[PDB]
CSV table of C-alpha atoms and ligand atoms in Angstrom, one decimal:
chain,number,residue,atom,x,y,z
A,1,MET,CA,110.8,87.3,65.8
A,2,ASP,CA,109.2,84.9,63.8
A,3,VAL,CA,105.9,85.0,64.8
A,4,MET,CA,103.5,81.2,64.1
A,5,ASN,CA,100.5,82.5,62.1
A,6,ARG,CA,101.5,86.0,63.2
A,7,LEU,CA,99.0,85.0,66.7
A,8,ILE,CA,100.4,84.6,70.5
A,9,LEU,CA,98.7,83.4,72.7
A,10,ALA,CA,97.7,84.8,76.5
A,11,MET,CA,97.6,82.5,78.8
A,12,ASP,CA,96.2,83.8,81.1
A,13,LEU,CA,94.9,80.9,83.5
A,14,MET,CA,95.8,81.0,86.6
A,15,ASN,CA,96.1,77.2,87.0
A,16,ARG,CA,98.4,75.8,85.9
A,17,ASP,CA,96.4,72.0,84.9
A,18,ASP,CA,93.6,74.3,83.2
A,19,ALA,CA,96.8,76.2,81.7
A,20,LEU,CA,99.2,73.1,80.0
A,21,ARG,CA,95.2,72.0,78.8
A,22,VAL,CA,94.7,75.0,76.7
A,23,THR,CA,97.5,75.3,75.2
A,24,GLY,CA,98.1,71.5,74.7
A,25,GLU,CA,95.1,72.3,72.8
A,26,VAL,CA,95.8,75.3,70.5
A,27,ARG,CA,99.8,74.7,70.0
A,28,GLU,CA,99.3,73.4,66.5
A,29,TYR,CA,98.3,76.9,66.1
A,30,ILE,CA,101.1,78.8,68.0
A,31,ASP,CA,104.7,79.0,68.0
A,32,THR,CA,105.0,82.3,71.3
A,33,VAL,CA,103.6,82.4,74.7
A,34,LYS,CA,102.8,85.4,76.5
A,35,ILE,CA,103.0,84.8,80.1
A,36,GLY,CA,102.3,87.3,82.6
A,37,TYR,CA,101.1,87.5,86.3
A,38,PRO,CA,98.3,85.9,86.6
A,39,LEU,CA,99.2,82.5,86.6
A,40,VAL,CA,103.2,83.6,87.3
A,41,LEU,CA,102.0,84.6,90.9
A,42,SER,CA,99.7,81.0,91.3
A,43,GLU,CA,101.9,78.9,90.2
A,44,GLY,CA,105.4,79.9,90.6
A,45,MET,CA,108.4,80.8,87.9
A,46,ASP,CA,109.4,77.3,87.1
A,47,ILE,CA,106.4,77.3,84.8
A,48,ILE,CA,107.8,79.0,82.3
A,49,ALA,CA,109.9,75.9,81.8
A,50,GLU,CA,107.2,73.3,82.3
A,51,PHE,CA,106.3,76.0,79.0
A,52,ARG,CA,109.5,75.1,77.3
A,53,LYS,CA,110.2,71.4,77.9
A,54,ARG,CA,106.3,70.9,76.6
A,55,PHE,CA,105.6,73.0,74.1
A,56,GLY,CA,109.4,74.6,73.1
A,57,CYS,CA,107.9,78.4,72.2
A,58,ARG,CA,108.9,80.8,72.7
A,59,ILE,CA,108.6,82.8,76.2
A,60,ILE,CA,108.2,86.6,76.6
A,61,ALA,CA,106.8,87.5,80.7
A,62,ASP,CA,104.6,90.5,80.8
A,63,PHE,CA,105.9,91.7,83.3
A,64,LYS,CA,105.1,95.3,82.7
A,65,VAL,CA,107.9,96.7,84.5
A,66,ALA,CA,107.3,100.1,86.1
A,67,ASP,CA,110.2,100.2,88.5
A,68,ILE,CA,113.7,102.7,90.2
A,69,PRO,CA,116.4,100.9,87.1
A,70,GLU,CA,118.2,99.2,90.2
A,71,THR,CA,115.3,97.1,91.1
A,72,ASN,CA,114.1,96.7,87.3
A,73,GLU,CA,118.1,95.3,87.2
A,74,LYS,CA,116.5,92.6,89.3
A,75,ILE,CA,113.4,91.2,87.6
A,76,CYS,CA,115.1,91.3,85.3
A,77,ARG,CA,117.5,89.0,85.3
A,78,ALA,CA,114.9,87.0,88.3
A,79,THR,CA,112.5,86.6,85.3
A,80,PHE,CA,116.0,85.6,82.1
A,81,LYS,CA,116.6,83.2,85.0
A,82,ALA,CA,113.5,81.3,84.7
A,83,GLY,CA,113.9,80.6,81.2
A,84,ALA,CA,112.3,83.8,79.3
A,85,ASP,CA,113.3,85.4,75.9
A,86,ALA,CA,111.8,88.3,76.1
A,87,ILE,CA,109.8,90.7,78.6
A,88,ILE,CA,107.7,93.4,78.7
A,89,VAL,CA,108.3,96.9,80.6
A,90,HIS,CA,106.8,99.9,80.9
A,91,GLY,CA,108.3,103.6,79.3
A,92,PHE,CA,106.2,105.6,81.5
A,93,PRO,CA,108.8,105.2,84.5
A,94,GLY,CA,111.6,107.2,82.0
A,95,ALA,CA,113.5,106.2,80.2
A,96,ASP,CA,117.6,105.0,83.0
A,97,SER,CA,114.4,102.4,84.2
A,98,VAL,CA,114.2,101.8,80.3
A,99,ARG,CA,117.9,101.0,80.0
A,100,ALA,CA,118.4,98.8,82.9
A,101,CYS,CA,116.2,96.5,81.1
A,102,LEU,CA,118.2,96.5,77.9
A,103,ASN,CA,121.0,96.0,80.4
A,104,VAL,CA,119.9,92.9,81.5
A,105,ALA,CA,118.0,91.2,78.1
A,106,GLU,CA,122.1,91.8,76.4
A,107,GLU,CA,123.3,90.4,78.5
A,108,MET,CA,122.0,87.5,78.7
A,109,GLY,CA,120.8,87.1,75.0
A,110,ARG,CA,116.6,88.2,75.6
A,111,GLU,CA,114.8,90.7,74.5
A,112,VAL,CA,112.7,93.9,75.1
A,113,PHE,CA,109.8,95.1,74.4
A,114,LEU,CA,108.7,98.4,75.0
A,115,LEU,CA,104.6,99.2,76.1
A,116,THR,CA,104.7,103.0,74.8
A,117,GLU,CA,100.0,102.4,75.4
A,118,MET,CA,97.7,100.7,76.5
A,119,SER,CA,94.5,99.1,75.2
A,120,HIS,CA,92.5,99.6,78.7
A,121,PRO,CA,89.8,103.1,78.9
A,122,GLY,CA,91.2,103.6,81.4
A,123,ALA,CA,94.9,104.4,79.3
A,124,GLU,CA,93.1,107.8,77.7
A,125,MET,CA,94.4,110.0,81.1
A,126,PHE,CA,97.8,109.9,81.0
A,127,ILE,CA,99.2,107.1,79.0
A,128,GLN,CA,97.4,108.7,75.6
A,129,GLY,CA,99.2,111.5,76.0
A,130,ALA,CA,102.9,110.4,76.8
A,131,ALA,CA,102.7,108.0,74.2
A,132,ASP,CA,104.4,108.9,70.9
A,133,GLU,CA,107.0,111.0,73.5
A,134,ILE,CA,107.6,107.0,75.0
A,135,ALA,CA,107.8,105.9,71.1
A,136,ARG,CA,110.3,108.8,70.6
A,137,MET,CA,112.3,107.6,73.4
A,138,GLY,CA,112.1,104.0,72.6
A,139,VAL,CA,113.9,105.1,69.4
A,140,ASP,CA,117.1,107.0,71.4
A,141,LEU,CA,117.3,103.7,73.0
A,142,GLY,CA,117.2,102.5,70.5
A,143,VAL,CA,114.9,99.8,71.6
A,144,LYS,CA,113.7,97.5,68.9
A,145,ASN,CA,109.9,96.1,70.0
A,146,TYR,CA,106.7,97.2,70.9
A,147,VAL,CA,103.4,97.0,72.6
A,148,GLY,CA,100.5,99.2,71.7
A,149,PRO,CA,96.9,99.0,71.4
A,150,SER,CA,94.5,97.4,69.0
A,151,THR,CA,91.0,98.4,71.0
A,152,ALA,CA,93.2,102.4,68.9
A,153,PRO,CA,93.9,101.0,65.3
A,154,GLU,CA,94.4,105.1,63.7
A,155,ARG,CA,96.4,104.8,67.9
A,156,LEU,CA,98.5,101.7,66.5
A,157,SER,CA,98.5,102.8,63.5
A,158,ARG,CA,101.0,106.0,64.1
A,159,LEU,CA,102.9,103.8,66.8
A,160,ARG,CA,104.3,101.8,63.5
A,161,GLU,CA,105.1,105.2,62.0
A,162,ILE,CA,107.4,106.2,64.5
A,163,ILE,CA,109.3,103.0,65.4
A,164,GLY,CA,109.1,102.1,61.5
A,165,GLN,CA,109.2,99.5,59.6
A,166,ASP,CA,112.1,97.8,60.6
A,167,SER,CA,110.4,97.5,64.2
A,168,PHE,CA,108.7,94.5,65.8
A,169,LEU,CA,105.5,95.4,66.8
A,170,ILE,CA,102.6,92.9,69.2
A,171,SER,CA,99.2,94.0,70.0
A,172,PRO,CA,96.8,92.7,72.9
A,173,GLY,CA,93.0,94.5,72.6
A,174,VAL,CA,91.7,91.9,70.2
A,175,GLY,CA,88.5,90.0,70.4
A,176,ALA,CA,87.3,90.1,73.6
A,177,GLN,CA,88.4,94.0,74.0
A,178,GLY,CA,86.9,94.6,70.5
A,179,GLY,CA,90.2,94.4,68.7
A,180,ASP,CA,89.4,92.9,64.7
A,181,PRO,CA,92.5,90.5,64.3
A,182,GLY,CA,92.5,91.2,61.1
A,183,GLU,CA,92.7,94.9,61.0
A,184,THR,CA,95.5,95.2,64.1
A,185,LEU,CA,98.0,93.1,61.5
A,186,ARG,CA,97.6,96.2,59.3
A,187,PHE,CA,99.7,97.7,61.3
A,188,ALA,CA,101.3,95.6,64.2
A,189,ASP,CA,103.4,92.5,63.5
A,190,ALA,CA,101.4,89.7,65.5
A,191,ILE,CA,98.3,90.2,67.6
A,192,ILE,CA,97.7,89.4,71.0
A,193,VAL,CA,94.8,87.0,72.3
A,194,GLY,CA,93.8,85.7,75.4
A,195,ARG,CA,90.6,85.0,76.8
A,196,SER,CA,89.4,84.7,72.9
A,197,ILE,CA,90.7,81.6,73.3
A,198,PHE,CA,91.5,80.2,76.2
A,199,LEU,CA,87.6,80.7,77.0
A,200,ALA,CA,85.6,80.3,74.0
A,201,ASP,CA,84.6,76.5,73.8
A,202,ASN,CA,85.9,75.8,72.1
A,203,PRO,CA,89.7,76.9,72.4
A,204,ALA,CA,91.4,74.7,69.1
A,205,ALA,CA,88.7,76.0,66.9
A,206,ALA,CA,89.1,79.8,68.2
A,207,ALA,CA,92.0,79.7,67.2
A,208,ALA,CA,91.4,77.9,63.9
A,209,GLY,CA,88.9,80.5,63.8
A,210,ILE,CA,91.0,83.8,64.1
A,211,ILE,CA,93.4,81.7,61.9
A,212,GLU,CA,91.1,81.9,58.8
A,213,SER,CA,90.5,85.6,59.4
A,214,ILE,CA,93.5,86.4,58.7
A,215,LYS,CA,94.6,83.7,55.9
A,216,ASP,CA,95.3,86.5,53.4
A,217,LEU,CA,97.8,88.4,55.4
A,218,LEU,CA,99.8,84.5,56.3
B,1,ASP,CA,92.7,104.0,111.3
B,2,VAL,CA,96.1,103.3,109.7
B,3,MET,CA,98.1,100.1,110.4
B,4,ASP,CA,100.9,100.6,113.0
B,5,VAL,CA,104.0,100.4,111.9
B,6,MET,CA,107.7,99.9,115.2
B,7,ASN,CA,109.1,102.7,114.3
B,8,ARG,CA,108.0,104.7,111.7
B,9,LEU,CA,110.2,102.4,109.5
B,10,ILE,CA,109.2,99.7,107.2
B,11,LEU,CA,112.5,97.6,105.2
B,12,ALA,CA,111.8,96.8,101.7
B,13,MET,CA,113.7,93.4,101.5
B,14,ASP,CA,114.7,93.2,97.8
B,15,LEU,CA,117.7,90.7,98.1
B,16,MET,CA,117.2,87.9,96.1
B,17,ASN,CA,118.7,84.9,97.4
B,18,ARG,CA,116.1,83.0,100.8
B,19,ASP,CA,119.0,82.4,102.8
B,20,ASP,CA,120.0,85.8,102.5
B,21,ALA,CA,116.9,87.9,103.0
B,22,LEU,CA,115.7,85.6,105.8
B,23,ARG,CA,119.0,86.4,107.7
B,24,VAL,CA,118.9,90.0,107.8
B,25,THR,CA,114.7,90.8,108.0
B,26,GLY,CA,115.5,88.4,111.8
B,27,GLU,CA,118.2,89.7,111.8
B,28,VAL,CA,116.0,93.0,112.1
B,29,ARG,CA,113.4,91.8,113.8
B,30,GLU,CA,113.4,93.7,116.9
B,31,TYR,CA,113.3,97.5,115.9
B,32,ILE,CA,110.8,96.7,112.2
B,33,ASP,CA,107.7,94.9,112.4
B,34,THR,CA,105.9,95.8,108.6
B,35,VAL,CA,108.6,94.0,106.0
B,36,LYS,CA,107.9,95.6,101.8
B,37,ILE,CA,108.6,92.6,100.0
B,38,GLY,CA,109.0,93.1,95.9
B,39,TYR,CA,109.4,90.8,92.4
B,40,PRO,CA,113.1,90.9,93.4
B,41,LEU,CA,112.3,88.7,95.6
B,42,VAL,CA,109.1,87.2,95.0
B,43,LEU,CA,110.3,85.7,91.2
B,44,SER,CA,113.4,83.9,92.6
B,45,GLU,CA,111.3,82.2,95.5
B,46,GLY,CA,108.1,82.3,94.6
B,47,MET,CA,105.4,84.0,96.7
B,48,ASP,CA,105.5,81.5,99.1
B,49,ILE,CA,108.2,83.8,100.7
B,50,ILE,CA,105.5,85.7,101.9
B,51,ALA,CA,104.6,82.7,104.2
B,52,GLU,CA,108.1,81.2,105.4
B,53,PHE,CA,108.3,85.9,106.1
B,54,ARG,CA,104.4,85.2,108.3
B,55,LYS,CA,105.6,82.0,109.9
B,56,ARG,CA,109.4,83.5,111.1
B,57,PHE,CA,109.0,87.3,111.7
B,58,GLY,CA,105.8,88.6,113.1
B,59,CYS,CA,105.5,91.0,111.0
B,60,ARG,CA,103.1,92.5,108.2
B,61,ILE,CA,103.8,92.7,103.6
B,62,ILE,CA,103.3,95.1,101.6
B,63,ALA,CA,103.7,93.3,98.5
B,64,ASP,CA,105.4,96.2,96.2
B,65,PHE,CA,103.9,94.3,92.5
B,66,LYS,CA,103.7,98.3,90.8
B,67,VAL,CA,99.9,96.8,89.5
B,68,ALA,CA,100.5,98.8,86.1
B,69,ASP,CA,98.8,96.4,83.7
B,70,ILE,CA,94.1,96.1,82.1
B,71,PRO,CA,92.0,96.2,85.0
B,72,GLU,CA,91.1,92.8,83.5
B,73,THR,CA,94.4,91.4,84.8
B,74,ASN,CA,94.7,93.6,87.3
B,75,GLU,CA,91.8,91.9,89.5
B,76,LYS,CA,93.2,88.0,88.8
B,77,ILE,CA,97.5,89.5,89.7
B,78,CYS,CA,95.3,91.5,93.3
B,79,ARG,CA,93.9,88.0,93.5
B,80,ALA,CA,96.5,86.4,93.6
B,81,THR,CA,98.8,88.4,95.4
B,82,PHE,CA,95.6,88.3,98.8
B,83,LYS,CA,95.7,84.6,98.3
B,84,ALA,CA,99.2,84.5,99.2
B,85,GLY,CA,99.4,86.5,102.1
B,86,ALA,CA,100.2,90.0,101.7
B,87,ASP,CA,98.0,92.5,104.1
B,88,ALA,CA,98.4,95.1,101.1
B,89,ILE,CA,99.6,95.5,97.3
B,90,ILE,CA,101.2,98.5,95.9
B,91,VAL,CA,99.9,99.9,92.9
B,92,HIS,CA,100.3,103.2,90.0
B,93,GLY,CA,98.4,105.4,89.0
B,94,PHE,CA,99.4,106.5,85.3
B,95,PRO,CA,96.9,103.1,84.2
B,96,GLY,CA,94.7,105.4,84.6
B,97,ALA,CA,90.9,105.3,86.8
B,98,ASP,CA,89.7,102.1,85.8
B,99,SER,CA,93.0,100.1,86.5
B,100,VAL,CA,93.1,101.0,90.1
B,101,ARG,CA,89.2,100.5,91.2
B,102,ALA,CA,89.4,97.0,89.5
B,103,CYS,CA,93.0,96.7,92.6
B,104,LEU,CA,90.1,98.9,95.1
B,105,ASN,CA,87.6,96.5,93.9
B,106,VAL,CA,89.8,93.2,95.4
B,107,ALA,CA,90.7,94.5,98.1
B,108,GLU,CA,87.2,95.5,99.7
B,109,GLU,CA,86.3,92.0,98.6
B,110,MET,CA,89.6,90.3,99.9
B,111,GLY,CA,89.7,92.6,103.5
B,112,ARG,CA,93.0,94.1,102.5
B,113,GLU,CA,94.3,97.0,101.9
B,114,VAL,CA,95.6,99.3,98.2
B,115,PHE,CA,98.4,102.0,98.2
B,116,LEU,CA,98.6,104.1,95.1
B,117,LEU,CA,102.7,105.3,93.8
B,118,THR,CA,101.6,109.2,93.1
B,119,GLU,CA,104.9,108.9,91.6
B,120,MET,CA,108.5,107.9,92.2
B,121,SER,CA,112.1,107.8,93.3
B,122,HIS,CA,114.4,107.8,90.8
B,123,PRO,CA,115.6,110.3,87.4
B,124,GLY,CA,113.6,109.6,84.9
B,125,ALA,CA,110.5,109.3,87.0
B,126,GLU,CA,111.3,113.6,86.2
B,127,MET,CA,110.7,112.1,82.4
B,128,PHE,CA,106.4,111.8,82.8
B,129,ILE,CA,104.9,110.8,86.1
B,130,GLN,CA,105.6,113.8,87.4
B,131,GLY,CA,103.5,115.6,85.3
B,132,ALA,CA,100.4,113.5,85.7
B,133,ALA,CA,101.4,113.3,89.3
B,134,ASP,CA,99.5,116.0,90.7
B,135,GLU,CA,96.6,114.7,89.0
B,136,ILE,CA,97.6,110.3,90.4
B,137,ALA,CA,97.2,111.9,93.7
B,138,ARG,CA,93.6,113.5,92.8
B,139,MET,CA,92.2,110.2,91.7
B,140,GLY,CA,93.7,108.5,94.1
B,141,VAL,CA,91.3,110.6,97.3
B,142,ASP,CA,88.2,110.4,94.5
B,143,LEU,CA,88.7,107.1,94.5
B,144,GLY,CA,88.8,106.2,98.0
B,145,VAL,CA,92.2,105.5,98.3
B,146,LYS,CA,93.3,106.0,101.6
B,147,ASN,CA,97.1,105.0,101.5
B,148,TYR,CA,99.3,106.5,99.4
B,149,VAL,CA,103.5,105.6,97.5
B,150,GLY,CA,105.6,109.2,97.4
B,151,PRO,CA,109.3,109.7,97.1
B,152,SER,CA,111.2,110.7,100.2
B,153,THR,CA,114.5,112.5,97.2
B,154,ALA,CA,111.7,115.0,96.6
B,155,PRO,CA,110.7,117.5,99.1
B,156,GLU,CA,109.1,119.6,97.8
B,157,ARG,CA,107.6,116.8,95.5
B,158,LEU,CA,106.6,114.7,99.1
B,159,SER,CA,105.3,118.0,100.6
B,160,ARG,CA,103.0,118.5,97.7
B,161,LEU,CA,101.6,115.3,97.3
B,162,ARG,CA,100.9,115.7,101.2
B,163,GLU,CA,99.2,118.0,101.0
B,164,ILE,CA,96.8,117.1,98.4
B,165,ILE,CA,95.6,113.5,100.3
B,166,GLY,CA,95.4,115.1,103.6
B,167,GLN,CA,96.7,114.8,106.9
B,168,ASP,CA,93.9,111.4,107.2
B,169,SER,CA,95.7,109.7,104.9
B,170,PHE,CA,98.4,107.2,104.9
B,171,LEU,CA,101.7,108.2,103.6
B,172,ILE,CA,105.0,106.1,103.0
B,173,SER,CA,108.2,106.5,101.1
B,174,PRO,CA,111.4,105.2,99.5
B,175,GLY,CA,114.0,106.8,98.2
B,176,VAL,CA,116.4,107.2,101.8
B,177,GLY,CA,119.9,106.3,102.1
B,178,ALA,CA,121.2,104.6,98.6
B,179,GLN,CA,119.7,107.3,96.7
B,180,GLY,CA,120.2,110.3,99.0
B,181,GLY,CA,116.9,110.5,101.2
B,182,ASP,CA,117.0,112.1,104.5
B,183,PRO,CA,115.0,109.6,107.5
B,184,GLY,CA,113.5,112.9,109.6
B,185,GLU,CA,112.6,115.4,106.9
B,186,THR,CA,110.9,112.7,104.9
B,187,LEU,CA,108.7,111.9,107.9
B,188,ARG,CA,108.3,115.6,108.3
B,189,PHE,CA,105.6,114.0,105.3
B,190,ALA,CA,105.5,110.4,105.0
B,191,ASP,CA,104.0,108.4,107.7
B,192,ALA,CA,107.1,105.9,107.4
B,193,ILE,CA,109.7,105.7,105.5
B,194,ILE,CA,110.9,102.4,103.0
B,195,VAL,CA,114.4,101.6,103.4
B,196,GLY,CA,116.4,98.4,101.2
B,197,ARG,CA,120.0,99.0,101.3
B,198,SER,CA,120.9,101.2,103.9
B,199,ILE,CA,119.8,98.7,106.4
B,200,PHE,CA,119.9,95.1,104.2
B,201,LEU,CA,123.6,95.4,102.3
B,202,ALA,CA,125.5,96.8,106.1
B,203,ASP,CA,127.8,94.9,107.3
B,204,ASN,CA,125.1,94.6,110.5
B,205,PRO,CA,121.9,95.5,109.0
B,206,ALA,CA,120.5,95.7,113.3
B,207,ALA,CA,123.5,98.4,114.1
B,208,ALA,CA,122.1,99.3,110.2
B,209,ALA,CA,118.8,100.3,111.2
B,210,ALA,CA,118.6,100.8,115.3
B,211,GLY,CA,120.8,104.1,113.6
B,212,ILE,CA,117.5,104.8,111.5
B,213,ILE,CA,116.1,105.0,114.5
B,214,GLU,CA,118.2,107.1,116.4
B,215,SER,CA,118.5,109.9,114.4
B,216,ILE,CA,114.1,110.0,114.0
B,217,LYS,CA,114.0,109.1,117.7
B,218,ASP,CA,111.5,112.5,118.9
B,219,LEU,CA,109.7,111.6,115.9
B,220,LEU,CA,108.0,108.3,116.9
C,301,BMP,O1,98.0,97.5,76.7
C,301,BMP,C1,97.3,96.4,76.7
C,301,BMP,C2,99.1,95.3,77.5
C,301,BMP,C3,98.9,94.3,77.5
C,301,BMP,O2,99.9,93.7,78.0
C,301,BMP,N1,97.8,93.3,77.7
C,301,BMP,C4,98.0,92.8,78.3
C,301,BMP,O3,97.7,92.0,76.9
C,301,BMP,C5,96.1,90.3,77.4
C,301,BMP,C6,94.9,90.6,76.4
C,301,BMP,O4,93.8,89.1,77.1
C,301,BMP,P1,92.7,89.4,76.5
C,301,BMP,O5,92.6,89.5,74.7
C,301,BMP,O6,91.9,88.2,76.9
C,301,BMP,O7,91.6,90.4,76.6
C,301,BMP,C7,96.2,90.6,79.2
C,301,BMP,O8,97.5,89.2,79.5
C,301,BMP,C8,96.7,91.7,79.3
C,301,BMP,O9,97.0,91.6,79.9
C,301,BMP,C9,96.6,94.2,77.5
C,301,BMP,O10,94.9,93.7,77.6
C,301,BMP,N2,96.9,95.4,77.1
C,302,BMP,O1,109.8,105.5,93.7
C,302,BMP,C1,110.4,104.3,94.0
C,302,BMP,C2,109.2,103.7,94.6
C,302,BMP,C3,109.0,102.6,95.0
C,302,BMP,O2,108.3,101.0,95.2
C,302,BMP,N1,110.9,101.8,95.3
C,302,BMP,C4,111.1,100.8,96.2
C,302,BMP,O3,111.6,101.2,97.0
C,302,BMP,C5,113.0,100.6,97.4
C,302,BMP,C6,113.8,101.1,97.5
C,302,BMP,O4,115.2,100.8,98.9
C,302,BMP,P1,115.8,101.3,98.7
C,302,BMP,O5,116.2,101.9,100.3
C,302,BMP,O6,117.5,100.2,98.7
C,302,BMP,O7,116.8,102.5,97.5
C,302,BMP,C7,112.9,99.9,96.4
C,302,BMP,O8,112.5,98.1,95.9
C,302,BMP,C8,112.2,100.1,95.0
C,302,BMP,O9,112.2,98.9,94.0
C,302,BMP,C9,111.8,103.4,95.4
C,302,BMP,O10,113.2,103.3,95.2
C,302,BMP,N2,111.2,104.8,94.3
């Protein structure tokens, strides 16, 4: 996956007009948008097609899929019917649940990203202790795309070690949550950035600023 | 107190076709006043499906969204879900206490309810979830969670969950029917059972629901 400027916009504004306007403002800097439940549940799944129509961007559906296999299959099918290129799935519910997602992705020509570890303080309670084993499970299952946390670069580095250099790794928690763009890109292929851009006084300047700070990594 | 679930039976409406979902739900309306709507139907037909179910049927709505994000995003998901008219939302506990608290805070502000999913009914649950389950449940109790979801397919584990949360907590349980769980055995511990495919794929969903209810008649 070739992500422009190694920068994925997390578009979590819940108003359609604002989401479209802000994305338009930063479109010269990105070609990949992560769309999650805040926007989808507020404005409907048709928003995905609208983004492709306006911007021609790739769309990663950040749905943190975390159900039983039967239900995971249906969620993936509905998501890809809406035009998402990829979907993010939790590993914590186990291998069968991940495989259900991999199957639908293969059938529809899409990708699964496995979330092995999260960026927020609560991740320490249960997720961190399982993370390495979840990553190894990804490797065993043939997963090639992963998500890990900007807010713990030592843990992000370990994730990169487990999955190898061939795997693709994207990383949220940059900016608002404290992660540094450049340090994160030592290990991740691309950074995910939400509020630092879309809540900035000037989103275009914020995006340009982040890119300037990593210019030697592009 | 607790939501008064008719016949201790919650329909899991996971048909993705709007017409079929409406037809089947209408057919079992006399048996069930509480419907669980998840992402298969919502992602296929929109959040307005909650609006349509409320209009068409006299049913409470539990949004089974297994909320599993960071606190910031969890708050937004809960807000959007309650805005659409869901009475309650189901949340994962494995992302930790801050993520659960975010959901509780929104539910409190908005006059709605959170259900905490402490462990799951499928084989994959054995890998990571089961080891964390007792602590996730204890965390729920510590946070003031009153409503819980636990698996009918693991009776010993469902029993332990009931012990941890106490008799006053409200517990609902999926995995009955298609996944092999028994209605009566499950209601030893759960307040209500969740049933999907064995009702909505039946030639006669009303007869299927009636049959389940007949099998648990003395528990009502
Ligand atoms: O561990 C994770 C996994 C995520 O997907 N995310 C997501 O990445 C985005 C981060 O946005 P922000 O840059 O505003 O903090 C949000 O959409 C959030 O749901 C995260 O923050 N941490
Ligand atoms: O551990 C769990 C938690 C669930 O919410 N569920 C949900 O309960 C329902 C089970 O439906 P069914 O009776 O067709 O197996 C599905 O909506 C599923 O997503 C489950 O099966 N196991």
